[PDB]
Amino acid sequence: PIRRREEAYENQRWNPMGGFCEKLLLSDRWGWSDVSGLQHRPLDRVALPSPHWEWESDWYVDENFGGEPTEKGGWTYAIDFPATYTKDKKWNSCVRRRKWIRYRRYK
């Protein structure tokens, strides 16, 4: 079976009012992006390459990070989006992201 995994990151920043939320800085990456932040990856717009592909399920969070489970929710935390991520919120974490995945299969 020929199978290909798509992924997309949901990116959030902490705000005194919203907590971790969808309000980002004008300098920040897209709220929905690839791992680099440079590519826009809204989930509903990742298309199948052709009608010969179908999705195996809906999008779901990959609750894994660095070869080990994440905490529930799949979030990882960092001081800023380009910095180093951990499964746990540190005292100086100002951002967080989680990885959504979806498999497509060829017919």
Residue numbers in the entry: 64 to 170
Q: Can you list sentences taken from the study reporting this PDB entry?
A:
Here, we identify TECPR1 (tectonin beta‐propeller repeat containing 1) as a receptor for cytosolically exposed sphingomyelin, which recruits ATG5 into an E3 ligase complex that mediates lipid conjugation of LC3 independently of ATG16L1. TECPR1 is comprised of a central ATG5‐interacting region (AIR) and an adjacent pleckstrin homology (PH) domain with affinity for PI(3)P and/or PI(4)P (Chen et al, 2012; Wetzel et al, 2020). These domains are flanked by two 5‐bladed beta‐propellor domains, whose blades are formed from WD40‐like TECPR repeats. Inserted between the first and second blades of each propellor lie DysF domains, named after their occurrence in the protein Dysferlin and so far without known functions.
However, upon reductive methylation of primary amino groups, confirmed by matrix‐assisted laser desorption/ionisation (MALDI) time‐of‐flight (TOF) and in‐source decay (ISD) mass spectrometry, the N‐terminal DysF domain of TECPR1 yielded diffracting crystals, the structure of which was solved to 1.9 Å resolution by molecular replacement with the NMR structure of the inner DysF domain of myoferlin. The N‐terminal DysF domain of TECPR1 represents an elongated finger‐shaped domain, which, overall, bore high similarity to the inner DysF domains of myoferlin and dysferlin (Patel et al, 2008; Sula et al, 2014a). The N‐terminal DysF domain of TECPR1 is comprised of a central pair of antiparallel beta strands connected via a long loop that wraps around the beta‐sheet and covers large parts of the domain surface. The loop is precisely positioned and held in place through planar stacking interactions between multiple tryptophan and arginine residues (specifically Trp 116, 118, 122, 138 and Arg 159, 161, 165, 167), a feature also found in Ferlin DysF domains (Patel et al, 2008; Sula et al, 2014a). Mutations of W77, L88, L89, I142, K152, K153 and W154 into alanine all abrogated recruitment, while mutations of I65, M80, E134, K135, T147, T149, K150, Y169 had little or no effect. Subsequent mutations of nearby residues R76, S90 and D143 into alanine and C84 and C157 into serine also abolished recruitment. Together these mutants identify a binding site located at the distal end of the domain, that is, the tip of the DysF finger. Consistent with the zwitterionic nature of sphingomyelin, the binding site is characterised by positively (R76, K152, K153) and negatively charged (D143), as well as hydrophobic residues. Notably, W77 and W154 are solvent‐exposed and upon binding may become inserted into target membranes. A comparison of the sphingomyelin‐binding site in the N'DysF domain of TECPR1 to the equivalent region in the inner DysF domains of myoferlin and dysferlin reveals little conservation of loop structures and exposed side chains, thus explaining why the latter domains are not recruited to damaged membranes.
